Amino acid sequence: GSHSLKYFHTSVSRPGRGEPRFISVGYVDDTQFVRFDNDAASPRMVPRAPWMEQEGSEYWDRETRSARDTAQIFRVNLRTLRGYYNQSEAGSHTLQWMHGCELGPDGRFLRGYEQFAYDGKDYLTLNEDLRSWTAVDTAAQISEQKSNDASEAEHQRAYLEDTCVEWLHKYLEKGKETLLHLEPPKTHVTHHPISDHEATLRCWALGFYPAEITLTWQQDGEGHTQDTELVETRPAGDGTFQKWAAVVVPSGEEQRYTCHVQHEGLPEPVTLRW
C-alpha cells in the first residue's frame, strides 16, 4: 500500500493586532504527528503523536527554526500579495501552502505535489512534472516569474523526491506499530421505525483506520440502492474514524437489505443485516 507525508500551512493577517497568525501541521497518512503555532512568545514545533516523543532536541530545534522561518516568509508573502491586488491593510487575508509526497507499493517515490492558495482560491500550483508552475492570474504570474528566477521548481522537486521520501521512511519506522496497522471497522445495524409501514436501517462503521471506507446498502443481493443517506467520514477523536449509511425500508421487508463494508483492514468485504 501507499503512504504519504503531508504538511498544511495557514497564515492569516491580523489588521490591528500585530503579526499574522501562522499554523503548520504535518500528517503521515491520516495521522497528525507535529504542529507549529506562532501564537506564542517563542513558538516551537511539538509532537502530536506518541511515537514522535522519542525525537531528540536536534530534531525539534531544527523543525522549530524551519517553521519560524516559514512564518516570517509568509508574513512577507502576505504583504506582497496585498500589493499585487491593491488591497487595503485593514482587511484580513489568508495564505495557504500544502505539499507532500506519496510512496508506491514498493516503498519508492510515486508522486509529489505543492500548492498555494490566497483567500480560499488557487494561486500558484506546482505542475505534475514538478518542473513548471501554473498561475491563476497576472498576480500569480509575477510569483511564477519569481519562482523561475530562483529555480524554485527544482528546489521543491528535490525536497519532494528526496527529503520528503527519506523522512517519510523514518516516520513510518518510528510509528510502525500504529502507522502500519490497519484497523477494521466494527459494524452493526440499528433499526428506527418511522411509522407503521416504514423503518430506518442505519449501518454503522466505527473505530477504523485509515479513513477511506465504502458503505453501500444492497437489496436482494443486487448491486446498489436508490435512497441512501450517507454522512461524511468523521474523526472519533482517538485516531480512528466513523461513518454510517441509512436507508428507509418497508416494515417487514428488512431482511431484503444488506449493508456492504469495504475497508483495507478487511481481507474481504463485510456483509451485515439487521
Binding site: T70, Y123, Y159
Partner: peptide, 9 residues
C-alpha cells in the same frame, strides 16, 4: 521534516 526554505511569492 519541513522544507528548509519556503518559497517567496
Amino acid at each position: 521534516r519541513l522544507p528548509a526554505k519556503a518559497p517567496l511569492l
